[PDB]
Scaffold this active site. Sequence first.
Site, mmCIF file in Angstrom:
data_model
loop_
_atom_site.group_PDB
_atom_site.id
_atom_site.type_symbol
_atom_site.label_atom_id
_atom_site.label_comp_id
_atom_site.label_asym_id
_atom_site.label_seq_id
_atom_site.Cartn_x
_atom_site.Cartn_y
_atom_site.Cartn_z
ATOM 1 N N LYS A 138 1.990 3.220 7.022
ATOM 2 C CA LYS A 138 1.834 2.423 5.809
ATOM 3 C C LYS A 138 0.549 1.633 5.951
ATOM 4 C CE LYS A 138 4.251 -0.733 2.691
ATOM 5 N NZ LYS A 138 4.981 -2.017 2.640
ATOM 6 N N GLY B 265 0.793 -1.232 0.000
ATOM 7 C CA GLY B 265 0.000 0.000 0.000
ATOM 8 C C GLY B 265 0.823 1.279 0.000
ATOM 9 N N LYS B 266 0.200 2.374 0.448
ATOM 10 C CA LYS B 266 0.808 3.721 0.437
ATOM 11 C C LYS B 266 1.284 4.218 1.810
ATOM 12 C CE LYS B 266 2.553 7.007 -1.993
ATOM 13 N NZ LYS B 266 3.831 6.606 -2.649
ATOM 14 N N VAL B 267 2.377 4.983 1.760
ATOM 15 C CA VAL B 267 2.952 5.662 2.903
ATOM 16 C C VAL B 267 2.403 7.080 2.987
ATOM 17 C CG1 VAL B 267 5.111 6.296 4.050
ATOM 18 C CG2 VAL B 267 5.024 4.277 2.593
ATOM 19 N N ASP C 155 17.812 -8.096 4.682
ATOM 20 C CA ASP C 155 17.637 -7.034 3.694
ATOM 21 C C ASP C 155 18.171 -5.709 4.203
ATOM 22 O OD1 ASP C 155 17.024 -6.151 1.120
ATOM 23 O OD2 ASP C 155 14.875 -5.950 1.490
HETATM 24 C C1 LIG Z 1 12.051 -3.639 15.051
HETATM 25 C C2 LIG Z 1 12.061 -3.405 13.534
HETATM 26 N N1 LIG Z 1 10.683 -3.099 13.138
HETATM 27 C C3 LIG Z 1 10.400 -2.470 11.971
HETATM 28 O O1 LIG Z 1 11.256 -2.161 11.174
HETATM 29 C C4 LIG Z 1 8.975 -2.156 11.633
HETATM 30 F F1 LIG Z 1 8.162 -2.378 12.757
HETATM 31 C C5 LIG Z 1 8.531 -3.048 10.471
HETATM 32 C C6 LIG Z 1 7.073 -2.726 10.135
HETATM 33 N N2 LIG Z 1 6.949 -1.284 9.781
HETATM 34 C C7 LIG Z 1 6.476 -0.884 8.560
HETATM 35 O O2 LIG Z 1 6.116 -1.701 7.720
HETATM 36 C C8 LIG Z 1 6.295 0.510 8.120
HETATM 37 C C9 LIG Z 1 6.899 0.920 6.914
HETATM 38 C C10 LIG Z 1 6.716 2.216 6.443
HETATM 39 C C11 LIG Z 1 7.330 2.720 5.188
HETATM 40 C C12 LIG Z 1 7.733 4.056 4.927
HETATM 41 N N3 LIG Z 1 8.228 4.113 3.714
HETATM 42 N N4 LIG Z 1 8.157 2.826 3.154
HETATM 43 C C13 LIG Z 1 8.614 2.442 1.819
HETATM 44 C C14 LIG Z 1 7.608 1.987 4.068
HETATM 45 C C15 LIG Z 1 5.935 3.081 7.199
HETATM 46 C C16 LIG Z 1 5.330 2.683 8.375
HETATM 47 C C17 LIG Z 1 5.488 1.401 8.853
HETATM 48 F F2 LIG Z 1 4.895 1.057 10.029
HETATM 49 C C18 LIG Z 1 7.406 -0.367 10.860
HETATM 50 C C19 LIG Z 1 8.853 -0.688 11.216
HETATM 51 C C20 LIG Z 1 12.624 -4.633 12.860
HETATM 52 C C21 LIG Z 1 11.904 -5.829 12.877
HETATM 53 F F3 LIG Z 1 10.706 -5.860 13.459
HETATM 54 C C22 LIG Z 1 12.398 -6.999 12.300
HETATM 55 C C23 LIG Z 1 13.631 -6.989 11.687
HETATM 56 C C24 LIG Z 1 14.365 -5.820 11.670
HETATM 57 C C25 LIG Z 1 13.872 -4.649 12.247
HETATM 58 CL CL1 LIG Z 1 14.894 -3.265 12.152
#
Ligand SMILES: C[C@H](NC(=O)C1(F)CCN(C(=O)c2cc(-c3cnn(C)c3)ccc2F)CC1)c1c(F)cccc1Cl
Lengths: 251, 265
Positions: free
Chosen positions: A26, A10-12, A113
């Site tokens: 998101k 989806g969209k941000v 990744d």
């Molecule tokens: C603890 C850390 N947690 C996370 O990374 C998140 F919880 C993953 C889920 N998330 C989003 O999907 C997200 C994405 C976006 C978004 C903005 N731009 N685009 C292109 C996308 C915006 C809002 C959002 F909520 C939120 C962050 C983690 C982990 F769980 C496991 C492994 C490594 C790591 Cl480092």
Amino acid sequence: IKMKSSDFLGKVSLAFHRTQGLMIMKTCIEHNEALLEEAKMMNRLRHSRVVKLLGVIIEEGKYSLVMEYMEKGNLMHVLKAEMSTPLSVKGRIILEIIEGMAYLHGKGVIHKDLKPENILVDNDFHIKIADLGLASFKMWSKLNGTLYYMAPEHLNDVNAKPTEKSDVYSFAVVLWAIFANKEPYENAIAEQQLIMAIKSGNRPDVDDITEYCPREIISLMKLCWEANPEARPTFPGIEEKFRPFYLSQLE
Amino acid sequence: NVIKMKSSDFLELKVSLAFHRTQGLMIMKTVYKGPNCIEHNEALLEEAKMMNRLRHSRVVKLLGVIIEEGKYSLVMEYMEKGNLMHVLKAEMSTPLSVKGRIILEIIEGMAYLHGKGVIHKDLKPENILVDNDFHIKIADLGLASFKMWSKLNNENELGTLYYMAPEHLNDVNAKPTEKSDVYSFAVVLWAIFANKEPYENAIAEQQLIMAIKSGNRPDVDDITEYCPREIISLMKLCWEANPEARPTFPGIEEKFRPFYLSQLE
Ligand SMILES: C[C@H](NC(=O)C1(F)CCN(C(=O)c2cc(-c3cnn(C)c3)ccc2F)CC1)c1c(F)cccc1Cl
Ligand SMILES: C[C@H](NC(=O)C1(F)CCN(C(=O)c2cc(-c3cnn(C)c3)ccc2F)CC1)c1c(F)cccc1Cl
């Protein structure tokens, strides 16, 4: 934290919580149990160098994840900005990446990744590691250039399991990108040619770093992109050599 | 990993300063000096391997063990400026920015230990050790968490209650938790700004224990130096009588870090 759409206005998109301020968002009744628990797994990873999932919106026909707003975007965006980022700040970025990765691996989490798009930057140039592609979250990912940081053992071999060493390889190329201020492999002809070249030992061009990069970091990037995974160090091992180097020379 | 070191690899502060032949200056705690117990050698080794798994920039490292006939010693890294109270009582004064950083590092250290399911049990300024750049590392110098090595000490030829949560005072079946460590932290914060031990006007130990159990705390007005209002709120919240009302170290980190970055750094 189970949030509601009516708490924002989806969209941000960039969103304003009524009690909690500025965040980034998101955007099937059977999957709701699994999606919630999968988000509870994301929320257990709490560390200053790891992005925080602040909550989740599970409504009828809207499934959203909500994280903290990181003012200066991803790492590549900061690096390519006109205001150049000094050696001391690059070194601290490196240390923080190491800390974030050490924390994740200490919790039995393999990123899979790691790349500059997944290194987010706050207003004071501090970093947090994120999983924006949802590599570690099957159901949320299902409900929804790219290969430059991927260890050669995963190129043309989708079935082999990632390890901590996969992330060490990624880190290596992030180090190169930090000092080059750009994506590697600009002069490659095609993607399959490149993939095979990488699998056979090809690496980012060390001579294409023009700015000063200390010898230690060049040695470190070479060790961390070794073809044999067992020849790459761990993140604890990297931290113990890099921290004192950072403190004496870069800080 | 842990190195089984030998006496012959080294050339009183029993704590001594020791110089390894190839690896330089360390500190040794020689735990036992007496007649040979070969049976416990396996358990002592593995126990040291287990505590060697606690590795973080803000916790001290066990560099090696000496398991020899009648001689049992632990070897750690040498921290050039000693403990936190020694730094604080020194003449060359410590600016607010360095104190704030010290607090952040202690929080990071404690958050790591708690994240591994370790409760310190005896957090205090003597257990907060300081390098030449004024970075800190948490230690467990009295062996509160090492059962066999602590047993070995009390077999053999060879603490303060100011930081102890009130629920453990006059309770000899004391059961410490993570909230016990948060209480200790609170009094550490006070001591960082007072530059001294609390409770100077207490006369007897029973008076103090009972006073503390009834809600008495370090004297906030006896901080002379500038301490930010926020840190005073934080020490008060952290020394709350009810343990459930004290925050966790991750909870503390999230409120403290951005305060540190905007105001103190
Ligand atoms: C603890 C850390 N947690 C996370 O990374 C998140 F919880 C993953 C889920 N998330 C989003 O999907 C997200 C994405 C976006 C978004 C903005 N731009 N685009 C292109 C996308 C915006 C809002 C959002 F909520 C939120 C962050 C983690 C982990 F769980 C496991 C492994 C490594 C790591 Cl480092
Ligand atoms: C990970 C960290 N590890 C440790 O703290 C140590 F391994 C404890 C054992 N050690 C000593 O006994 C020691 C003591 C002294 C000594 C100096 N002065 N005095 C009065 C005594 C000198 C040399 C020494 F080897 C070494 C450091 C830990 C932990 F395991 C569990 C809980 C919290 C924490 Cl933080």
